[PDB]
Design a protein around this ligand. Structure first.
Ligand SMILES: N[C@H](CCCP(=O)(O)O)C(=O)O
Ligand SMILES: N[C@H](CCCP(=O)(O)O)C(=O)O
Lengths: 258, 260
């Protein structure tokens, strides 16, 4: 890895990878900033390679066409050898790990609830046993998928409530869901990743996360299968974690920058 | 893996692996129950192997003597070919990753704050900026080591307050720390792993976790370097997670079974 150059696939997603706020055009890696940009910088420092950030062209993380065997997104880019590393808010999942390899996690998370502050609602269970408060998710997102496939009775009942609701509780973006909570006066809760919720609550003091996590998953760096660099990056992630550098990066991007 | 018999090394730790509360004597794997006991059951069903649970013979997780280079604990059992898998509340660490392989995590955790319910204390930063509420940790434990070694200013400040408080804010057991919170009328908060906090707050209805995690870490299954089971077990853990089986196991042992 010393004196090598890697292509890093990523995806625009706040605050992991973002276009910098400057009217002056920026070139190459310089146009981007965020937690993932800083993470690959720290990994490249420890291991001494150069890299080039390329946004994934189809703007997708990676899903499998069960019928055709066809992948899209960042996963496809690794499998086609157009990227050496995928560094993003990319979840380690069973389906993806059949096609690519993942490092140990650099961030942990789970589905949770975004709601208004100062209510009696304390848990998913308080939502499910009632009908006045509506709740939804990003249409066709990973949170919607979790509820669709859950066989935990509480969440199966919640997906049932979600699909049976009219007008529609699903949103076309997470900023639309956040607005629906912010303007809903308690009539609407939004389901998304806990990391996304933290980012929102840092910037909207009337909003809060309700309860804990409804599932447990992680973001890791994905590599082509049997990549010769996964094991070296694993050690770097654990070192950065233990030194507190990942905690600093999270504080920086969730609480300091905007 | 179909038709082989694996040795699993583990360690008594609530609610991961506990001796069953029976007066009838129990043999073999029968003697044990818990989250980790149920997890190895699930993995063995999927991959089709038999297994023997053996408690680690020195009662240790696995630390490296830097001077000598000797491993102890569950890590030693794997590396001496006396266990095939280590399945416990075993943290994935840099030092261990240099000697063994780890699966992807089956559980995520971090240091957090155990306190009384319904105060305006919301974060470690709120504790650090005041002096009335004292806070401590298990003496000699990983949480205390986390604070000792931290280079984040909040936690350096907390560590300075902890070492200088009189009477000592440190405890000989987590149970002692929990009791100090419970009986303290808000005068004491206890720092420990978020998994331990959740076990307590499920059984102590006046207590809560305050804030989120001050560090990050995970438990994973460890194998000898290059084992042909790491990658098969990785897929099992991810499948169990997504099917909801790991959520069910957590409810069972944290929110349903009390003793063990
Ligand atoms: N975690 C990424 C997608 C991000 C979650 P979303 O913003 O779609 O709710 C993944 O699906 O791998
Ligand atoms: N997590 C285990 C040991 C637990 C550390 P403690 O709870 O005694 O601070 C390990 O990985 O060493």
């Amino acid at each position: 890895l010393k004196n090598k150059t890697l292509v890093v696939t990523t995806i625009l997603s706040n605050p992991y990878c973002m276009r910098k706020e400057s009217a002056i055009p920026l070139s190459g890696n310089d146009q981007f900033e965020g937690y993932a940009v800083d993470l690959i910088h720290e990994i490249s420092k420890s291991l001494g390679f150069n890299y080039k950030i390329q946004l994934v062209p189809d703007g997708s993380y990676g899903s499998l066409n069960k019928l055709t065997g066809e992948w899209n997104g960042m996963i496809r880019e690794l499998l086609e050898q157009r990227a050496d590393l995928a560094i993003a808010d990319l979840t380690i999942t069973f389906e993806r790990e059949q096609a690519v390899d993942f490092t140990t996690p650099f961030m942990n998370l789970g589905v949770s609830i975004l709601y208004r502050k100062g209510t009696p609602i304390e848990s998913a269970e308080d939502l499910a046993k009632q009908t006045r408060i509506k709740y939804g998710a990003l249409k066709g997102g990973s949170t919607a998928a979790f509820f669709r496939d859950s066989k935990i009775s509480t969440y199966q009942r919640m997906w049932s409530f979600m699909e049976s609701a009219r007008p529609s509780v699903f949103t076309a973006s997470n900023g639309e869901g956040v607005e629906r909570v912010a303007k809903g006066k308690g009539s609407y809760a939004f389901l998304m990743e806990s990391t996304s919720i933290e980012y929102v609550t840092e910037r909207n003091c009337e909003l809060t996360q309700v309860g804990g996590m409804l599932d447990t998953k992680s973001y890791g760096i994905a590599t082509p299968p049997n990549s010769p660099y996964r094991t070296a990056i694993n050690s770097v992630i654990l070192k950065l974690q233990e030194e507190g550098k990942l905690h600093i990066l999270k504080t920086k991007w969730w609480k300091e920058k905007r």
